[PDB]
Design a protein around this ligand. Structure first.
Ligand code: HEM
Ligand SMILES: CC(C)[C@H](O)C(=O)N[C@H](CO)Cc1c[nH]c2ccccc12
Length: 392
């Protein structure tokens, strides 16, 4: 079977093999960097099936040497569970991670974007939209929400890569950093149990201790993935989105003159940005399933190449084109079905506030270097810039 990934992900370029696979062989057998061989799934319709059809399981992966790009299986907490365990954690989170809580964060989120832009301006151009905006914006928001002290970022931020690194960390470094993060969250939970604050960890501990009993370890592992999602996924998506906007200056001009397009713009960025470097987490078939002419037998794994589903020309017209006016946008950038992104309302809020504020306050914002000089973060499960120098 083809060794997969076929090629290292470069900048935001999509490997042209996905288009060929989608056209000529949408499901193909591959060998993975780690774990068992798998079926690479490339089309939008098959993506929905393996993500939402109950014939495909995440919890089954623990009964295998899970097909994966990471040296060790990731502690994916809720995202590694099936019903009923999944239902138990999803209910817990939905009860404390309410829409009211999110919209109550809006003024704090807006204020953080304005404060970050005040700093960029006071420091003068060129500024770095990654370490000077996307990272601390995403970080302060998730830290505010979760109850992780943003002041501890110096400690915990260097452990987060352990949850995402493919080629650039050893088993031993991943295991050590995973233990460091879990143990840091566990100490936080002791404080938050005794001294609850208005944050998710306190609410989760209270709800778990009182009704929806979770083990300490389950609580730790769930708070940990919430930290990763808010800190890393959000800042990665945001900085990649700014890159897309800078490299499509015509759409950036359109957005600035019709701000009511921002909701559809965020959705189009979710679709178009190939944020996931290759695939999200493998599922395993519990029964035989045919996908685009390929029989996937029970016990075999499928790799969901979500970014390729989001370039499916049979679902999105001119799927290879970034078009922030796109109206039909059933993208899978926030997943689909049972494991669809619980944080999507918040991520959409953050995206909209960040882009609106930047475009509002920095009218002539533009990249300070040619796209060729940019340094990307390689060897992770998502794509991101290390620096995005800008003028204004
Ligand atoms: C732009 C930012 C984000 C993107 C692109 C994103 C994307 C995704 C995707 C694609 C999935 C499904 C993965 C799969 O099926 O293998 C997912 C699941 C999930 N995401 Fe998000 N996410 C983002 C931000 C967030 C935030 C801010 C949170 C929480 C504060 C969050 C929490 C979760 C959780 C808990 C799950 C698993 C839910 C379950 O298994 O039931 N994400 N996310
Ligand atoms: C979830 C997809 C966008 C993709 O698999 C990804 O970024 N995984 C990272 C790195 O392994 C881990 C992660 C990010 N949010 C999560 C939410 C729940 C569990 C794990 C994660």
């Amino acid at each position: 079977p083809l060794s997969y990934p076929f090629n290292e992900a470069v900048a935001l370029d999509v490997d042209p093999l996905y288009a060929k696979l989608r056209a000529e062989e949408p499901v193909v057998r591959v060998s993975c960097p780690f774990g068992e061989d798998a079926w690479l799934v490339t089309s939008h319709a098959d993506m929905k099936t393996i993500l939402a059809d109950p014939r495909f399981s995440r919890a089954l992966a623990a009964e295998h040497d899970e097909s994966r790009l990471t040296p060790l299986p990731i502690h994916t907490s809720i995202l590694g569970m099936d019903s009923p365990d999944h239902t138990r954690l999803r209910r817990l989170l939905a009860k404390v991670f309410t829409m009211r809580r999110v919209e109550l964060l809006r003024p704090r989120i807006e204020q953080e974007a304005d404060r970050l832009i005040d700093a960029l301006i006071a420091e003068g151009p060129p500024g770095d939209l990654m370490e000077g905006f996307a990272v601390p914006f995403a970080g302060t928001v998730v830290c505010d929400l979760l109850g992780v002290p943003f002041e501890d970022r110096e400690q915990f931020r260097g452990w987060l890569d352990a949850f995402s690194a493919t080629t650039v960390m050893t088993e031993e470094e991943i295991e050590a950093d995973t233990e460091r993060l879990h143990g840091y969250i566990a100490q936080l939970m002791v404080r938050r149990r005794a001294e609850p604050q208005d944050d998710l960890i306190s609410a989760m501990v209270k709800a778990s201790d009182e009704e929806e009993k979770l083990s300490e370890k389950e609580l730790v592992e769930l708070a940990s993935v919430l930290l990763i999602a808010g800190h890393e996924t959000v800042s990665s998506q945001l900085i990649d989105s700014l890159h897309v906007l800078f490299t499509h200056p015509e759409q950036l001009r359109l957005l600035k003159d019709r701000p009511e397009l921002m909701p559809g713009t965020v959705e189009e960025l979710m679709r178009f940005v190939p944020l996931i470097s290759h695939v999200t987490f493998a599922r395993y078939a519990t029964e035989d399933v045919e996908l685009s002419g390929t029989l996937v037998r029970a016990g075999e794994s499928v790799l969901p190449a979500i970014p390729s589903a989001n370039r499916d020309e049979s679902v999105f017209e001119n799927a290879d084109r970034f078009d922030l006016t796109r109206e039909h946008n059933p993208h899978l950038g926030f997943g689909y079905g049972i494991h669809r992104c619980l944080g999507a309302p918040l991520a959409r809020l953050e995206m909209q506030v960040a882009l609106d504020s930047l475009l509002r306050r920095l009218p002539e914002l533009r990249c300070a270097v040619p796209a060729e000089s940019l340094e990307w973060k390689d060897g992770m499960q998502v794509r991101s810039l290390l620096e995005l120098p800008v003028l204004w």
